[PDB]
Structure formats: C-alpha cells, structure tokens
Amino acid sequence: GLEVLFQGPGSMESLLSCRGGKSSWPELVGKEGHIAAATVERENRHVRATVMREGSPTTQDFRCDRVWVVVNNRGIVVSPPHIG
C-alpha cells in the first residue's frame, strides 16, 4: 500500500513501496502500549511493533516494516503509531 517519496539531499527523488494495507493507527492513541502493539501486528502482518518511551533519540532512517508504539511514563500511547 504505502508509497513514500523522499525529496533527498539535493533534487534527489526516491520511492519506498511498503508492503501491506494499514500504515497509521489513530484509534490506538490512549490505549496501553501492549494492546496497541498487538493490534498493529494483527492488522498488518508485514510490520514489527516495538514499544518506545516518548522523545528517545530517533535513528535517522525510515523502515517500511517498523511501527514505533510511542508511550508516556504510564505505558499509554501518546501519538498515532505509523510505519517508519
């Protein structure tokens, strides 16, 4: 499903064609990290969902098969989990 156009270091164009259907989980904001991560993997079998604390240093890459489930100190999802 998901196509991502990267407007690269120059006039560099590149595309990623990510595999599955769903790329974004707005309905998971406010749920427990572990419920959210299970739902992500259930709804898209091509992505690996990993729970992460807010504002941890982000690696400068984009991965079709990764869904960060970003949680606060209480383990609650604060942002829509999405592919990247």
- In DSSP notation, 21-84 reads S--B-GGGTTSBHHHHHHHHHHH-TT-EEEEEETTPPPPS---TTEEEEEE-TTSBB-S--BB-
45 in Cβ contact with 9 (< 8 Å): no
Return the C-alpha torsion angle 66, 1, 81, 34, nearest 10.
-70
- Nearest in space to 75 (alpha carbons), one of 59, 42, 52: 52
Domain boundaries, the chain: 3-83
Q: For strand 13-17 and strand 48-53, is the pairing parallel, antiparallel, or unpaired? A: unpaired
Q: Report residue 42: phi and psi, to 5°.
A: -60, -45
Say which CATH class 3-83 falls into.
Answer: alpha beta
Distance CA 33, CA 81 (A): 10
Distance CA 12, CA 46 (A): 28
Distance CA 25, CA 49 (A): 12
Distance CA 72, CA 40 (A): 18
The experimental resolution of this structure, in angstroms, equals 2.6
Distance CA 79, CA 64 (A): 18
Method for this entry: X-ray
Distance CA 1, CA 60 (A): 23
